[PDB]
Design a protein around this ligand. Structure first.
Ligand SMILES: CNC(=O)c1cnc(Nc2ccccc2C)c(NC(=O)c2cc(F)cc(C(F)(F)F)c2)c1
Lengths: 1004, 272
C-alpha cells in the first residue's frame, strides 16, 4: 500500500465518504481523516434520517462496514476501532451490511494479511488441492507448538518469548578462560528501589560456570553477610530469591532463565572476550510474566471440513510426452528464424536421460502436436523426477546460436505420489538475467500466475487407471530381489570423504563407491558422495539405496545440510537430512544457518514436507528464530516464484505465533511508513534540492501519526532492542544517491545507560541487501571458527537485514570512520599525496597511554581477519571509503553488495598505511617482528577456513535458488575452490596464499 | 603421436571451461585435459553421454597408459584412438559410446585476412566496443522490462479493485430498485411527487457516481492495454538482442587467439 488512498499519500484533514446503506440510498458523509469507524457509523445513521426510506434501517448496532482495499479485497471491517485512514481504502466509500460469520476470525485474518503483505482470503480461492491440504495439514504442527509452550506456564511461555541466547557448547577455549581470574568472573548485579526509581549495584566474583540461580545465591549471600543467619535461615532466603527473581541484561530484553552455565550465555561469553563488565539487573518474575499477555490458538474455519490404482512398476512402456502448442510468445518474426521447445527429464541437476526437442517451427505458428520419446522406462522413474522444458529461438549463419525464451518445470509425480496424466497447460517464467543455458532445472516447479505470459500446453499418457509410486513395502523387496573386509580400498574411501562437495568425482570412483556401498556406513561422511554415484534412472539401484539410507548413521548438521541443496531431491534422502537437524542442530546454529535453511525450502518439491514442518515447528517454539523466520520469508513476498509457498507458510506462522504478531505488525507498519517516505524522496523529489528534502523529512517525521508508528517498537535487526522515542535532532538523509535514512532512537530500558543510550540504524530503499546479509553472515561464521580454534581475530559482522525487494536495515557502528575519512584528518606529504602515517597518528591520538598496545593488537588482529576473509571470498579490492576502523582500533569492511555490482587488481588490501600501524610506525615495516607474527596470523586463519571449506561450500550451494545473480550455478562457487586451493594439498595451498600475500604487499 | 599437437588435448583448462564446451552437445563428443590437480603426467578425459559430462581418470604407470587397474597403452593417443575405433562398452557395458567427435584447440580461428597485428590492435578493439554497447542496451532493456512488469501488476490489481467497487455499486442499484419500487408506487397514488423526487434525486446521484468510476476503470484499462503492448515489445527486442550478444562475445573472445599467437599481454596493453 503506497498511501491511505489509491494514488494518494495521505488523506486531507476532512474528506467526503460515499456511504451505501442497506436501503438503496447513498449518503455523502464529511468525516475527519482520523475518524474511527465507530464514529463514522454513528454519525452516518444520524445523518441517514435526512434521507428517504429511513424506516427500513435496523438499529446501528446491527450493521458493520465493508469496502474495497488497495489490495482489491472486499474487507469486512469488524474491528470498528480503526481509523478511516488506516483501512488502506481503494476509494473513499463504505457499504453497510449485516455482519456474518465469526467476528474474531475475520478480525484476526486482517491482522495476518497486513503482516504477510497479502490478504488471506486469496488462499481460500485457490483451486489447487495441494494448497488447501497444506493449510489444513500443518495446523497440527501449530497445535503441537502452542500446546508445548503453554505446558509449564508461565515459565514455558517466557522460554518461548525470551529464549536463552547461549553458545552451542559450555566449553570455553582456553584463550577465553585465560581472561578469567583463576577461573572466576566479576559481575555486577543491579536493583531499582521504587520511591524514585533509584539504582543500586552489588559487585560479585563467581566461578564462570555458575548457573543464574547460583549467581542469585552469591548475591543474597553477599548482602546477608552481617545479618547473623544460620545455615538454614540463609537457605530459606536463598530459596526465596532463587524462586522469586531472575536476571536480566541491563539495556536490552535478554533474560537468564534455563540454568546454562553462566559463561555459556553469549552476552557473558563476550564480556569475557572483550574483558568488559557484565552488568545484570535482578528482576521480579511476576513483573516479567506480567508483560506476557496470554495468547490462544483458535483453529481456523478451513481447518475442519470439505464438502482402483496401479503401481508405476507395472507400466511396461517407455516414457513419452506430447507437446501441443504455445501462446503469447514474444519473438521478432524477421530477426528470429524459428522456434522449438527443448525438454529433459531431470533428477536434481543430472539428466535422467538424453534431452529431446520438438521440430523447429515458424515463430508465427507455435504449434507442434509432437509426442517426444525419452530413453527411460516408466518404472525406472525415481520419485523426484521432474520435467524441465523451455521455448527456444534460433538464428543461423559463423555458428548458429540458440537462446531460451521462457522456461518451466513440472513434477512428474504430485504430492499424492500419483503420476501425471492427461492434458496440462502451464504458463512459463521469464529467463533469469544472465542465464544462457537452454533449460533451468534449478528453477521452481509450477505455472506462472502472471497473466498474458507464454502458456505451453502438453499431454501425458493416460494409462487405463490412476498410477501411483510404489509403497516402500515393495521397494525393499525389490532390493532383496536385485541384490541377488578389504584394506587398501579402505584408505581410498576415507580419502574420498575428505574431498569437498564440489570435487571432481570420476566414473571409476563413483561406481567404486557403489560397489563398496555397504562398507560406506563405516564412514558416514561419504553419504553425499555415494548418493551422487547412484544411477537414479535404475529402479534397481534406487531401491537398494533406499535400504542403505534407512539405516544410515546420523551425520552432523554441517554435513546434513548439503543433502538439502538442489542436488539431492529424493524425499527419503532429504528426510534423513531433516532428522539429523532436529536431533543435532542447536537453536543457536539453526538461528545461524536460518538464511540457507529458508532458501532450501524453494528446492522442496511439494508444499508439505519434512523440512518446512521442522522449521515451522522451531519457529513457533523459539520466538528468536521465529522473528527472523518471519522476516526472511516476508522479505521475498514480492517474488511471485515463491509468494504462494512462503505466503501459506507465513499464514500458519502468524496464526500460531501468539501475541507476538501484534509486535510484528508494528514493525511492518514502521517499515511501510519509511518505505513510502523514501519513495517520495526518490520518485517525487529527485528534481529538488538537498535542503528541500531535509525540510520535508523533518516536517513529515514531525507528524503525530508518523511518530506514534515509528516510536515504541522492537528493532527488526535484534528484537531484544526496544526502539523508543526518536532523536529527530539526529535523523537525516544521507549523501548516497539512493538517499537512505540515518535514524536514531532512544533506548527506553530502565538502565539503558549501561549498554547504549541511543540506537541508530540506516534504512535504505533501492539496494539489494541479501548480498551483504550473506557476506556478513559468512564473516560471522569465519570469526566463530577462528575463536573456537584460539585465533582471537575480531570481525565486525554488523547487523543487516533485507525486509523486501531492495530494501532493509543496516546497523550503524558507533565511534568509527572510514580510512578515507581518516586520511582527510591528516595532511599531505608527497606532492599531492596523503601522509601514510596519518592512520597510525590518529590511532595514537585516540589511544593515548598504556591502551596503545591494545589498539595495535586489535587493529592487527581485525586486519588479519579481513585480509584473509576478503581474499577467500573475492572481496579484496576495496576502496579506502569501503574500509572502516573504530576509535577502539577495530577494522572492518562495509558495503559488500556495492562492490559486487561495481565489478560489473590486488588479492586483498594490505596498504602501506596498515603496515605503519601494524609495525607501530617503523621503517621498512615489512621486516619487523610485529609484521612477522601478523602474516603468521593470516596463514593460520587461512588454513583454519580451509579446514572448514565444506561448510562454506554447502552454505553457498544452498543459496543457488535465491535469485541472487552472484549465485546462479555451481560454477559461480568454483571461485572459492581456487582461493582455498582445494585441488591442491596443504603446503601447496599455504605457498599459494603466501604468494598472494607478497602480491598484496605490492612487492617483496 | 604428439599429445601436445592432438586435436582433443586442450590441457590447462578448468572443469567450468569444459562444461562450457560440452553444453548440449551430442553423445560421443569428448575432450581431454591434464588433471585439475595440475600434477604432471596425470590426465582426465570427459565425454558426453546421456546429457551428462562423465569424467574418467587416465592412470599412468611405467610409461604405460590406461584408465583401469590393468594398464596397457604406450601413449594417450594410442589409448584415445583405440576407443575412437571401438566402443567403451569394453570398459562399462552401460557406456556403449565411442569417442566419436573431438573438439579441438585451433580448428576455429575465424581470422581471414593478412595477419597484420591490427587484428587485435584494431578489430578486437572494435568487436569489444561492439559487445559492450550491445551489452549495455540489453541491460537497459531488462531494467525497463522489470519496471514495466511491476507497473503492470499494479494496474492489474487496480482494475481488479475497480471490479469489486463496481460490483458493490451495482448491487446497490439492484437493492435500491428492490426496496424503493413499492414505496415509489405507494407515493404515486398519494400524489406525493415531492418524496418520489427525493428518491429519484438520490438514485440519479448513485448512478451518476457509478458512471464516474466506470469511466475511471476503462481509462485505466486503456493505460494497461497500451502498457501491456510495449511490454511485449521490450521482450521481443531482448530476445532479438540475446543471440547477437552471444555471437559477438564468442567472436570477441576467440579473437584473443591472435593475442595468444603473440603469447603475452604486451598487445592488449595497447588497449589499456
Ligand atoms: C573480483 N572478484 C571475483 O572475481 C569473484 C569471482 N567469483 C566469486 N564467486 C564466489 C566466491 C565465494 C563465495 C561466493 C561467490 C559467488 C566472487 N565472490 C562473490 O561473488 C561473492 C562473495 C561473497 F562473500 C558473497 C557474495 C554474495 F553476496 F553474492 F553472496 C558473492 C568474486
Amino acid at each position: 500500500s503506497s498511501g491511505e488512498l489509491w494514488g494518494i499519500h495521505l488523506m486531507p484533514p476532512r474528506i467526503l465518504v460515499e456511504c451505501l446503506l442497506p436501503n438503496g440510498m447513498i449518503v455523502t458523509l464529511e468525516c475527519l481523516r482520523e475518524a474511527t469507524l465507530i464514529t463514522i457509523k454513528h454519525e452516518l445513521f444520524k445523518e441517514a434520517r435526512k434521507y428517504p426510506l429511513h424506516q427500513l434501517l435496523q438499529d446501528e448496532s446491527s450493521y458493520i462496514f465493508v469496502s474495497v482495499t488497495q489490495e482489491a479485497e472486499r474487507e469486512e471491517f469488524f474491528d470498528e476501532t480503526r481509523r478511516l485512514c488506516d483501512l488502506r481504502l481503494f476509494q473513499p466509500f463504505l457499504k453497510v451490511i449485516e455482519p456474518v460469520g465469526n467476528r474474531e476470525e475475520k478480525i484476526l485474518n486482517r491482522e495476518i494479511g497486513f503482516a504477510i503483505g497479502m490478504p488471506v482470503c486469496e488462499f481460500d480461492m485457490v483451486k489447487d488441492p495441494e494448497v488447501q491440504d497444506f493449510r489444513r495439514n500443518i495446523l497440527n504442527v501449530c497445535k503441537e507448538a502452542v500446546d508445548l509452550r503453554d505446558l509449564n506456564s508461565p515459565h514455558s511461555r517466557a522460554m518461548y518469548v525470551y529464549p536463552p541466547n547461549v553458545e552451542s557448547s559450555p566449553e570455553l577455549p582456553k584463550h577465553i578462560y585465560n581472561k578469567l581470574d583463576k577461573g572466576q568472573i566479576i559481575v555486577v548485579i543491579w536493583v531499582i528501589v521504587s520511591p524514585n526509581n533509584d539504582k543500586q549495584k552489588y559487585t560479585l566474583k563467581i566461578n564462570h560456570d555458575c548457573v543464574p540461580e547460583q549467581v542469585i545465591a552469591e548475591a543474597i549471600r553477599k548482602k546477608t553477610r552481617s545479618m547473623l543467619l544460620s545455615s538454614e535461615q540463609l537457605k530459606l532466603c536463598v530459596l526465596e530469591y532463587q524462586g522469586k527473581y531472575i536476571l536480566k541484561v541491563c539495556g536490552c530484553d535478554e533474560y537468564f532463565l534455563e540454568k546454562y552455565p553462566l559463561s555459556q550465555y553469549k552476552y557473558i561469553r563476550s564480556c569475557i572476550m572483550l574483558g568488559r563488565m557484565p552488568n545484570l539487573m535482578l528482576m521480579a518474575k511476576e513483573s516479567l510474566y506480567s508483560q506476557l499477555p496470554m495468547d490462544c490458538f483458535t483453529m481456523p474455519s478451513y481447518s475442519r471440513r470439505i464438502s482402483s490404482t496401479k503401481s508405476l512398476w507395472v507400466i511396461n512402456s517407455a516414457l513419452r510426452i506430447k507437446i501441443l502448442c504455445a501462446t503469447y510468445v514474444n519473438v521478432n518474426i524477421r530477426d528470429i528464424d524459428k522456434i522449438y521447445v527443448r525438454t529433459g527429464i531431470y533428477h536434481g541437476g543430472e539428466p535422467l536421460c538424453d534431452n529431446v526437442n520438438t521440430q523447429r517451427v515458424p515463430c508465427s505458428n507455435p504449434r507442434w502436436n509432437e509426442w517426444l520419446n525419452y530413453d527411460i522406462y516408466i518404472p525406472d522413474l525415481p520419485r523426484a523426477a521432474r520435467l524441465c522444458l523451455s521455448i527456444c529461438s534460433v538464428k543461423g549463419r559463423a555458428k548458429e546460436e540458440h537462446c531460451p525464451l521462457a522456461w518451466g518445470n513440472i513434477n512428474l509425480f504430485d504430492y499424492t505420489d500419483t503420476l501425471v496424466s492427461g492434458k496440462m497447460a502451464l504458463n512459463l517464467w521469464p529467463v533469469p538475467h544472465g542465464l544462457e543455458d537452454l533449460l533451468n532445472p534449478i528453477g521452481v516447479t509450477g505455472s506462472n500466475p502472471n497473466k498474458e505470459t507464454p502458456c505451453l500446453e502438453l499431454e501425458f499418457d493416460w494409462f487405463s487407471s490412476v498410477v501411483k509410486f510404489p509403497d516402500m513395502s515393495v521397494i525393499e523387496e525389490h532390493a532383496n530381489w536385485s541384490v541377488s573386509l578389504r584394506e587398501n580400498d579402505k584408505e581410498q574411501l576415507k580419502a574420498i570423504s575428505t574431498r569437498d562437495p564440489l570435487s571432481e568425482i570420476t566414473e571409476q570412483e563413483k561406481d567404486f563407491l557403489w560397489s563398496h556401498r555397504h562398507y560406506c556406513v563405516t564412514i558416514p561422511e561419504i553419504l553425499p558422495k555415494l548418493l551422487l554415484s547412484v544411477k537414479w534412472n535404475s529402479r534397481d539401484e534406487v531401491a537398494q539405496m533406499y535400504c542403505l539410507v534407512k539405516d544410515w548413521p546420523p551425520i552432523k548438521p554441517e554435513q546434513a545440510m548439503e543433502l538439502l541443496d538442489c542436488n539431492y531431491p529424493d524425499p527419503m534422502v532429504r528426510g534423513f537430512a531433516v532428522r539429523c537437524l532436529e536431533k543435532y542442530l542447536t537453536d543457536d546454529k539453526l538461528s545461524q544457518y536460518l538464511i540457507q535453511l529458508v532458501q532450501v525450502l524453494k528446492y522442496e518439491q511439494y508444499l508439505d514436507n519434512l523440512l518446512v514442518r521442522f522449521l515451522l515447528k522451531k519457529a513457533l517454539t523459539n520466538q528468536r528464530i521465529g522473528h527472523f523466520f518471519f522476516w526472511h520469508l516476508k522479505s521475498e513476498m514480492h517474488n511471485k516464484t515463491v509468494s504462494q509457498r512462503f505466503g501459506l507458510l507465513l499464514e500458519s506462522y502468524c496464526r500460531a505465533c501468539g501475541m507476538y504478531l501484534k509486535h510484528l505488525n508494528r514493525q511492518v507498519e514502521a517499515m511501510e511508513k519509511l518505505i513510502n517516505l523514501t519513495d517520495i524522496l526518490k520518485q517525487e523529489k529527485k528534481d529538488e534540492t538537498q535542503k528541500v528534502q531535509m525540510k520535508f523529512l523533518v516536517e513529515q517525521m514531525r507528524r503525530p501519526d508518523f511518530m506514534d508508528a515509528l516510536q515504541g517498537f522492537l528493532s527488526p535487526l535484534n528484537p531484544a532492542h526496544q526502539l523508543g522515542n526518536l532523536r529527530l535532532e539526529e535523523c537525516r538523509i544521507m549523501s548516497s544517491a539512493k538517499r537512505p535514512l540515518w535514524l536514531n532512537w532512544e533506548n527506553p530500558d530502565i538502565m539503558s545507560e549501561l549498554l547504549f543510550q541511543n540506537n541508530e540504524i540506516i534504512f535504505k530503499n533501492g539496494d539489494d541487501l541479501r548480498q551483504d546479509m550473506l557476506t556478513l553472515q559468512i564473516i560471522r561464521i569465519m570469526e566463530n571458527i577462528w575463536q573456537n580454534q584460539g585465533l582471537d581475530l575480531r570481525m565486525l559482522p554488523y547487523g543487516c537485514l533485507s525486509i523486501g525487494d531492495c530494501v532493509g536495515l543496516i546497523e550503524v557502528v558507533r565511534n568509527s570512520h572510514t580510512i578515507m575519512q581518516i586520511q582527510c584528518k591528516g595532511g599531505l606529504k608527497g606532492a599531492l599525496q596523503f601522509n601514510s602515517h596519518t592512520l597510525h597518528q590518529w590511532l595514537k591520538d585516540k589511544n593515548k597511554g598504556e591502551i596503545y598496545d591494545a589498539a595495535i593488537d586489535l587493529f592487527t588482529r581485525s586486519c588479519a581477519g579481513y585480509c584473509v576473509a576478503t581474499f577467500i571470498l573475492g572481496i579484496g579490492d576495496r576502496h579506502n571509503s569501503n574500509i572502516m576502523v573504530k576509535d577502539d582500533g577495530q577494522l572492518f569492511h562495509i558495503d559488500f553488495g556495492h562492490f559486487l555490482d561495481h565489478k560489473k587488481r590486488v588479492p586483498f588490501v594490505l596498504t602501506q598505511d596498515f603496515l605503519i600501524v601494524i609495525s607501530k610506525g617503523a621503517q621498512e615495516c615489512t621486516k619487523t617482528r610485529e609484521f612477522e607474527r601478523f602474516q603468521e596470523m593470516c596463514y593460520k586463519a587461512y588454513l583454519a577456513i580451509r579446514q572448514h571449506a565444506n561448510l562454506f561450500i554447502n552454505l553457498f550451494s544452498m543459496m543457488l535458488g535465491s535469485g541472487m545473480p552472484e549465485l546462479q550455478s555451481f560454477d559461480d562457487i568454483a571461485y572459492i575452490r581456487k582461493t582455498l586451493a582445494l585441488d591442491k594439498t596443504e603446503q601447496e595451498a599455504l605457498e599459494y596464499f603466501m604468494k598472494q600475500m607478497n602480491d598484496a604487499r605490492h612487492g617483496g | 603421436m604428439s599429445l601436445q599437437d592432438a586435436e582433443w588435448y586442450w590441457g590447462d583448462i578448468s572443469r567450468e571451461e569444459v562444461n562450457e564446451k560440452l553444453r548440449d552437445t551430442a553423445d560421443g563428443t569428448f575432450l581431454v585435459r591434464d588433471a585439475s590437480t595440475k600434477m604432471h603426467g596425470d590426465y582426465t578425459l570427459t565425454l558426453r553421454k546421456g546429457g551428462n559430462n562423465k569424467l574418467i581418470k587416465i592412470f599412468h604407470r611405467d610409461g604405460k597408459y590406461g584408465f583401469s587397474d590393468p594398464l596397457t597403452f604406450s601413449s594417450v593417443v594410442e589409448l584415445i584412438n583405440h576407443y575412437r575405433n571401438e566402443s567403451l562398452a569394453q570398459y562399462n557395458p552401460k557406456l556403449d559410446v565411442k569417442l566419436l567427435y573431438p573438439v579441438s584447440k585451433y580448428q576455429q580461428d575465424q581470422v581471414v585476412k593478412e595477419d597484420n597485428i591490427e587484428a587485435v590492435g584494431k578489430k578486437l578493439h572494435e568487436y569489444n566496443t561492439q559487445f559492450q554497447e550491445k551489452s549495455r542496451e540489453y541491460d537497459r532493456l531488462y531494467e525497463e522490462y522489470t519496471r514495466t512488469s511491476q507497473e503492470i501488476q499494479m494496474k492489474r490489481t487496480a482494475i481488479e479493485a475497480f471490479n469489486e467497487t463496481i460490483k458493490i455499486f451495482e448491487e446497490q442499484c439492484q437493492t435500491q430498485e428492490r426496496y424503493s419500487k413499492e414505496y415509489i408506487e405507494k407515493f404515486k397514488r398519494e400524489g406525493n411527487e415531492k418524496e418520489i423526487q427525493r428518491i429519484m434525486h438520490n438514485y440519479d446521484k448513485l448512478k451518476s457516481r457509478i458512471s464516474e468510476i466506470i469511466d475511471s476503470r476503462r481509462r485505466l484499462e486503456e493505460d494497461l492495454k497500451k502498457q501491456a503492448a510495449e511490454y511485449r515489445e521490450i521482450d521481443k527486442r531482448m530476445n532479438s538482442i540475446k543471440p547477437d550478444l552471444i555471437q559477438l562475445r564468442k567472436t570477441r573472445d576467440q579473437y584473443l587467439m591472435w593475442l595468444t599467437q603473440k603469447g603475452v599481454r604486451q598487445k592488449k596493453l595497447n588497449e589499456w
